[PDB]
From Swiss-Prot:
It comes from the Bacteria. Its main location: other. GO terms for biological process: cell adhesion. It is a single-pass membrane protein. This is Type IV major fimbrial protein FimA. The keyword Transferase does not apply. GO terms for cellular component: membrane; pilus.
Length: 151
């Protein structure tokens, strides 16, 4: 290669990158943020069990098999929260329960995408066991929120 060839190539590559790297970063961050939903889906049974005693949260019980409010992944910690609504009874009202996903509180700590670290994705549960995200409690960029939860 010639100097001018190298200079022209390095130029085009540099410019393409200007657009590519930020798209690559967003995609890494979206990919990591997805762990939140997996965590939250894994908590569905605990929530169900907890609600038998009329509360979203529940202490872990040695004798009963029952478990607590947390599940910790690589990119986030997910915690059961909320105030149960006994009156809510139709598939598309909220039961009052939520899952609070805090990114950067997983096993990887703050060593994860910096686009999400310290961000919160809060998921409201509905009577049918479904999640849609809670805007207002959610810090996480819409860009990074998984589609299944935006309905």
């Amino acid at each position: 290669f010639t100097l001018i060839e190298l200079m022209i190539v390095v130029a085009i590559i540099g410019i393409l990158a200007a657009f590519a790297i930020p798209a690559y970063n967003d995609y890494i961050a979206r990919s990591q943020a997805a762990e939140g939903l997996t965590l939250a889906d894994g908590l569905k049974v605990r929530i169900s069990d907890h609600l038998e005693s009329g509360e979203c949260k529940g202490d872990a019980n040695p004798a009963s098999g029952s478990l607590g409010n947390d599940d910790k992944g690589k990119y986030a910690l997910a915690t059961i929260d909320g105030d149960y609504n006994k009156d809510a009874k139709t598939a598309d009202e909220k039961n009052g329960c939520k899952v609070v996903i805090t990114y950067g509180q997983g096993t990887a700590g703050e060593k994860i995408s910096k686009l999400i670290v310290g961000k919160k994705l809060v998921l409201d549960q509905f009577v049918n066991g479904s999640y849609k995200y809670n805007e207002g409690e959610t810090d996480l960029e819409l860009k990074f929120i998984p589609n299944a939860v935006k309905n």
